[PDB]
Amino acid sequence: MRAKWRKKRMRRLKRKRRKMRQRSK
Amino acid sequence: VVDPFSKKDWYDVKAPAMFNIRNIGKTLVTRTQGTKIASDGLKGRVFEVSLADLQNDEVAFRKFKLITEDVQGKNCLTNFHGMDLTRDKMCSMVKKWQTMIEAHVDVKTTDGYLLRLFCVGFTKKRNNQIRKTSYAQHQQVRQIRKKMMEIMTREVQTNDLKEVVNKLIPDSIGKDIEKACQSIYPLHDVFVRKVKMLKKPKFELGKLMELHG
Amino acid sequence: TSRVQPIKLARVTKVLGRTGSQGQCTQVRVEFMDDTSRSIIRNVKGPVREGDVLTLLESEREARRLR
Amino acid sequence: TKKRRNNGRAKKGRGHVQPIRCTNCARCVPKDKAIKKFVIRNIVEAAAVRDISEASVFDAYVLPKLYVKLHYCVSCAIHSKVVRNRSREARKDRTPPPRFR
Amino acid sequence: SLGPQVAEGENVFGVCHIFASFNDTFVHVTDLSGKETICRVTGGMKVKADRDESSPYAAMLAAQDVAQRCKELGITALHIKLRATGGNRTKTPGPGAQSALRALARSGMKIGRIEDVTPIPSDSTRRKGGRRGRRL
RNA sequence: AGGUCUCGUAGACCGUGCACC
RNA sequence: CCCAUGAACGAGGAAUUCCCAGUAAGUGCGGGUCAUAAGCUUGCGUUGAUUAAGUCCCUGCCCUUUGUACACACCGCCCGU
RNA sequence: GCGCAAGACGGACCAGAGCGAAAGCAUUUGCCAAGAAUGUUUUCAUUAAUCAAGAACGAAAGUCGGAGGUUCGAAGACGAUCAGAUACCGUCGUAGUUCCGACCAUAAACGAUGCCGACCGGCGAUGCGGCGGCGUUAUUCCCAUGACCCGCCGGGCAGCUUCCGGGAAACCAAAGUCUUUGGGUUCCGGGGGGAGUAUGGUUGCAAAGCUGAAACUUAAAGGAAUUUGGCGAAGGGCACCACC
């Protein structure tokens, strides 16, 4: 595992968490 | 069902009077099948010939392009359309550790012939030179290019087609190119790379009559 | 082909290394007596010494490697 | 560690060069890093030039050549055996091998 | 069908275009102007194998067929217009072109000028493929 | 007046592949 | 040992083995086996060749260089759901 | 084979060459503007390379409004391959790839090495400008010029060698002048994860950039280098238990 795909999966989970929090509020 | 070569005619081309061999080849066209005329089909034909097969025994790698626009029967009358060079010669001219110089002018003759004279220039290494590089400055290249501008402006504008065609057969313009730019930078390989036809005037039969004499 | 070309016979000068997939054919420098100056490199199969002469059918093709 | 003095290229005071597509491959290799092949060859091969020579209308007609430049990616160069690998002290050699054939 | 000249001393001249890619070979013969063709044979004419359209065997079979065609037509002199695939891709000619012209010359044919007429670009568009190349 | 100038040897490529482990 | 009995077999597909001079091969004779005893093996002797003085193509072995995140050593180490 | 139309790009010339603060820059010509270096017995006379606040520029990809959409080409469709592909491969193929302006400021933006100043070896070439000195050429005589040759000077991209010296070694004219430690001056790192993560602030239309933890777990994670070892890596040697 290279840093690019852990960066991409962190980006994906961060963006789904923050979109869930903005539509929750 | 029917063979397509049964109703096929045969015609012969004629080089103009500026050259030493009047006949160079033959062509073939179908008959006048209704509204389609066999004389029309010889109008849009470009015959791509070599200069060594056109004159006797000389520089061979020059190339000519001819156009046919006048047929009456069993003859095709040609005209100069453009001059080229072989790809092998120009690929042999380009080499590393030397400077390539390009120069083109759109020029007009005394008649309504619009020309375009492409030329190349390659620097010459001195026989006692120790440097392997053998380059030139940019402004020297600009001065040589401006010299080419005024040379091809001078030699084509003041005169007609026949004399510059007869000058094109030997290396007269090229020897003038080494003679003009020997003071700026000594260069040895110069040629007229390509001649492109741009504009034709209103066609008449008479200039084609003393074209062939 | 379809040309009646005459048989030219040749004489050896020097033996060289042998080529081939299994290493069976020998490159040999060989030359003609009717024209002494022109010499050719040919592929010959079999044990060849120095001093003998060789019969040849074609003087047109050039020798080459294992393929 | 560092393998070579340079980085397999000739970039010293530029920082950016124009890439050119490979011939066998299609890689966007740069100009200074890629290995370039300029081959000198005739139109035909050596075992037929005489057969052309008796089939010619002209006498003593010279055979023309082909002058092409081949741009090779390093994977295509090592796959086609154009360039091989050397030792540690053997890589300290800039001169080309001698052309004998 | 035939020519008005006597076939004793002089000869007739036409050109033949030899296109040679890595997947096919072409033997296309036109007149000196190049506008009017007489025949065209390809490597797919003679070999019933899809991998061997560009091969010296199909090249020599097509060369013998076009030699028979130009012999019954009476064409005696040919000029070679050799070309590769050209374009933005590679410029080396196919292997069938040399064998095709050799087998054409082996049939008692007369040739004149030999020149290469492939479409060499100054600078064309982007080559098909990716940045990482046609890797496999 | 002669008629085959003398001396030594690479002058090598030039049909050739390759999925899936 | 003697007399009767006279099958397959018309030079064998794919594939594969051994061999450079008194050698392969065709013969016969000794020893071991043996109370009765050679279609096996080891030697001896007769006659006695074709082809070659090389190659890395096949099949294996050995060496140099190169890369290694392997050292119980690729039958290795090692990522993620 | 002859023409027309549209879009993209400037090969070969093209180099361990040049310029620019860096990204980056290649068809000719014209216009405007800036700058290095060279030369100076020209002018001012300490006017300084040092920099948080702050400011400009900034590869590709990503977003927004317009005409163009040649070629190529993320997602997607189809066919092979495979035990299994929505992978390698082939054909189409949307957005983009192209321009004008409005954004964001992220790269292995790497010489993986901050800026200025001084000192410490040689050699051979390169580019610019200047300088001196046989000879040849723009045909033969005389001068300046361009071209070539032999030397010097300063700046720049660079190369070879070493007990100068240093370093863990790769290697270094700097990565030296460092315990025989101190020229001046910004930014930045105390084992490995967790983690560039949560929260907060910040800017952004969006995509998101900057600042930036703790709990808990681990005795290793790592850098240079030597010897059989393993390559679906290259090269060579030998063998009638391999071949011809």
From Swiss-Prot, chain A:
Signal peptide: none annotated. Its main location: cytoplasm. GO terms for molecular function: structural constituent of ribosome. It is found in: Cytoplasm. The keyword Ribonucleoprotein applies. One of its GO terms (cellular component) is ribonucleoprotein complex. Keywords: Cytoplasm, Ribonucleoprotein, Ribosomal protein. Pfam families: Ribosomal_L41. Residues 1-25 are annotated as: Disordered. One of its GO terms (biological process) is translation. Component of the small ribosomal subunit. Component of the small ribosomal subunit. The ribosome is a large ribonucleoprotein complex responsible for the synthesis of proteins in the cell. Interacts with the beta subunit of protein kinase CKII and stimulates phosphorylation of DNA topoisomerase II alpha by CKII. Belongs to the eukaryotic ribosomal protein eS32 family. This is Small ribosomal subunit protein eS32. The lineage of its organism: Eukaryota, Metazoa, Chordata, Craniata, Vertebrata.
Curated annotation (Swiss-Prot), chain B:
Keywords: Acetylation, ADP-ribosylation, Cytoplasm, Differentiation, Isopeptide bond, Nucleus, Phosphoprotein, Ribonucleoprotein, Ribosomal protein, Ubl conjugation. Transmembrane segments: none annotated. Belongs to the eukaryotic ribosomal protein eS1 family. GO terms for biological process: cell differentiation; translation. This is Small ribosomal subunit protein eS1. There is a cross-link at residue 14 (Glycyl lysine isopeptide (Lys-Gly) (interchain with G-Cter in SUMO2)). Component of the small ribosomal subunit. Mature ribosomes consist of a small (40S) and a large (60S) subunit. The 40S subunit contains about 33 different proteins and 1 molecule of RNA (18S). The 60S subunit contains about 49 different proteins and 3 molecules of RNA (28S, 5.8S and 5S). Identified in a IGF2BP1-dependent mRNP granule complex containing untranslated mRNAs. Binds with high affinity to IPO4. Interacts with DDIT3. Part of the small subunit (SSU) processome, composed of more than 70 proteins and the RNA chaperone small nucleolar RNA (snoRNA) U3. ADP-ribosylated at Tyr-135 by PARP1 in presence of HPF1. Its main location: cytoplasm. It is found in: Cytoplasm; Nucleus; Nucleus, Nucleolus. GO terms for molecular function: structural constituent of ribosome. The chain holds residues 21 to 233 of 264 of the full protein. The modification N6-acetyllysine is found at residues 14, 36. The modification ADP-ribosyltyrosine is found at residue 135. One of its GO terms (cellular component) is cytosolic small ribosomal subunit.
UniProtKB/Swiss-Prot annotation, chain D:
One of its GO terms (cellular component) is cytosolic small ribosomal subunit. Component of the small ribosomal subunit. The ribosome is a large ribonucleoprotein complex responsible for the synthesis of proteins in the cell. The modification Phosphoserine is found at residue 53. Residues 86-96 have a biased composition (Basic and acidic residues). Belongs to the eukaryotic ribosomal protein eS26 family. Signal peptide: none annotated. It comes from the Eukaryota. Zn(2+) binds at residues 22, 25, 73, 76. Keywords: Cytoplasm, Endoplasmic reticulum, Phosphoprotein, Ribonucleoprotein, Ribosomal protein, Zinc. GO terms for molecular function: mRNA binding; structural constituent of ribosome. This is Small ribosomal subunit protein eS26. The keyword Ribonucleoprotein applies. Component of the 40S small ribosomal subunit. GO terms for biological process: translation. The keyword Transport does not apply. It is found in: Cytoplasm, Cytosol; Cytoplasm; Rough endoplasmic reticulum. InterPro entries: Ribosomal_eS26 (IPR000892), Ribosomal_eS26_CS (IPR047864), Ribosomal_eS26_sf (IPR038551). Its main location: cytoplasm.
From Swiss-Prot, chain E:
The keyword Cytoplasm applies. There is a cross-link at residues 46, 48, 91 (Glycyl lysine isopeptide (Lys-Gly) (interchain with G-Cter in SUMO2)). It comes from Oryctolagus cuniculus (Rabbit). The modification Phosphoserine is found at residues 1, 124. The keyword Ribonucleoprotein applies. Component of the small ribosomal subunit. The ribosome is a large ribonucleoprotein complex responsible for the synthesis of proteins in the cell. Part of the small subunit (SSU) processome, first precursor of the small eukaryotic ribosomal subunit. During the assembly of the SSU processome in the nucleolus, many ribosome biogenesis factors, an RNA chaperone and ribosomal proteins associate with the nascent pre-rRNA and work in concert to generate RNA folding, modifications, rearrangements and cleavage as well as targeted degradation of pre-ribosomal RNA by the RNA exosome. PANTHER family: 40S RIBOSOMAL PROTEIN S14/30S RIBOSOMAL PROTEIN S11. GO terms for molecular function: structural constituent of ribosome. It is found in: Cytoplasm; Nucleus, Nucleolus. The gene is RPS14. The lineage of its organism: Eukaryota, Metazoa, Chordata, Craniata, Vertebrata. This is Small ribosomal subunit protein uS11. Residues 116-136 are annotated as: Disordered. It comes from the Eukaryota. Keywords: Cytoplasm, Isopeptide bond, Nucleus, Phosphoprotein, Ribonucleoprotein, Ribosomal protein, Ubl conjugation. GO terms for cellular component: cytoplasm; nucleolus; small ribosomal subunit.
